[PDB]
Each structure stands twice: as structure tokens, then as C-alpha cells.
Amino acid sequence: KLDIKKTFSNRSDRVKGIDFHPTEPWVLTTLYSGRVEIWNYETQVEVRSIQVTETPVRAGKFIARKNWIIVGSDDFRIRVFNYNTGEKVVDFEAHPDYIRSIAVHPTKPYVLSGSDDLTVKLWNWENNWALEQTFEGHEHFVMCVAFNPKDPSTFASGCLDRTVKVWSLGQSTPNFTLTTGQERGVNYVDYYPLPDKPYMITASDDLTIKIWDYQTKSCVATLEGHMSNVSFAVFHPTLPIIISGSEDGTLKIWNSSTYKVEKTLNVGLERSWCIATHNYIASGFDNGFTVLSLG
């Protein structure tokens, strides 16, 4: 029940992070080679290409209310560029180890970064990028951080320690810790966006995707079928589907009501690493990225 069309594919070096601009028809990509790119996926014309560092850049988001992109790299630094002027406007060492994930608060001037240093950190760009809090307690690399879109005073961290921790700004330890049973770790965590379900979702190298009710703390469903590490899984914001991507080279679209697979796509770009949703979706791979239209 889903007409998947190809919008824009671009060959490049390995794409580790990806994000959609909320009002311009752009995607940001952050590459293994240290370059970051902004592309207009409608005109298929590059808007910016910047060599940021010599190391991988794994995390990248738009902060469109400031005309920014924010990126985090394996050289331990967070950098911000104004995409209208092209200029770097902030640059600081954020962690003493790799940055895996950056999340931006939807209404407040807060950024979270998750790191191989076992922490999440909260930065305030209206307080000279002050470190406002460090969230400690995970036992392995923090792979993914996400605000709860229904209450962004809380957020989740997914970690190779096999847990998700849900935290509140200004509170010392987690609201709660979810033990996932994904014994090879958690690579990704995402929240269901709409009010009807208090659900979250996790992806693992153990080849499973798990859906969680964060109120009951129970596992609602397990989605299996990928044949290698599952890099991500997310709920689509407007369609009743889940989209996952794997080192098996496939994207899978799952029915979010039935928890069964609907489509498996091999877009021919080798391993999948990252995802964004705008009914556009975009994913980064070993050999470039693709933007797809669903409806």
C-alpha cells in the first residue's frame, strides 16, 4: 500500500550521519572522510561541501532556527557552521573520545551529545555553550541520543551496555533504565512520535529490533529478518510504518500495526548506517545516500 519512488541518489564516500532541513528541501550528510555536505534533493544541486576535519564525522543535525548545521567528529569536537555564510561559528572539544550522536531540543537552545566516553552531555548555546550537565552511568559507548518529542524535558540514550536510559534535564540519575535483552548492545533508540502509544524502539547487532512500551517497561514486539547488524530503526512520523537499515545492505519497511515486514529494499550502496525522516526518508550508506518518497 506504499508507492516507493526514488527522489535523489548520490555516490560518495561512506555516509555516517544524515538529517533533513525542516523548511528547505535539503539533506545534510556527514562523511567518514571528514567532509560534510548539504544537498538540495529537489534540484539535485549541492548547496555546501565543507572539509571539516581529517577524521570521521558521525553526527550531524540542522538547527534551522539559527541557520546552522551542528556536527560531531572522531577528533572529539563539536562544530557549528552557518550554512548561509558557509563559516564555522563554534568549535570546541566536547568529550575525550568519539562523538556518536547529537540531538537538538525542539524549542530550547539545548544540544545533547553522546560519546564513547560513556556519557551524554548537555550544552546551552545561549550560555556560551556551557556544559550544563553530564549524564553518567552507562558502561559502554553511548550510540544514540533522542529527545522525547512529546516531552523534550526527557530524552533517551541507547548504549552498547545493552540498556536504554531515560533521563530528565536537571535530574542526576535516570528516570529509569531499560534492560533490553539485546546482548550485543543497543545501536539506536527512537520514540514513537504521536500521543496514542508511549512506545520506543531499539536496534542491535544481535539482528533484532525491539518495540518497548515505556510506561509498562515491556517489550511489545520483536522485528526479525535482517541478516547483519541493525544500524537503526525509527518510527515514521506520518505513516504507520517503521524503517530499519542494516549492514546487510537493505532497508526494511515494517508495518507499525502488525509488526510484519512490508518491503525490503537493496538500493545498491552496500552497508546502511544512518537514517532521517522529513513522506520523504533518507539513508546513508558505504557508497553514498538515497532520498526516497513514500507518498
Binding site: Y98, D116, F141, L160, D205
Partner: peptide, 6 residues
Amino acid sequence: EAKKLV
């Protein structure tokens, strides 16, 4: 080490 780097 591959998990950290890839």
C-alpha cells in the same frame, strides 16, 4: 576494534 571504527 572494528565496532568502534566502522
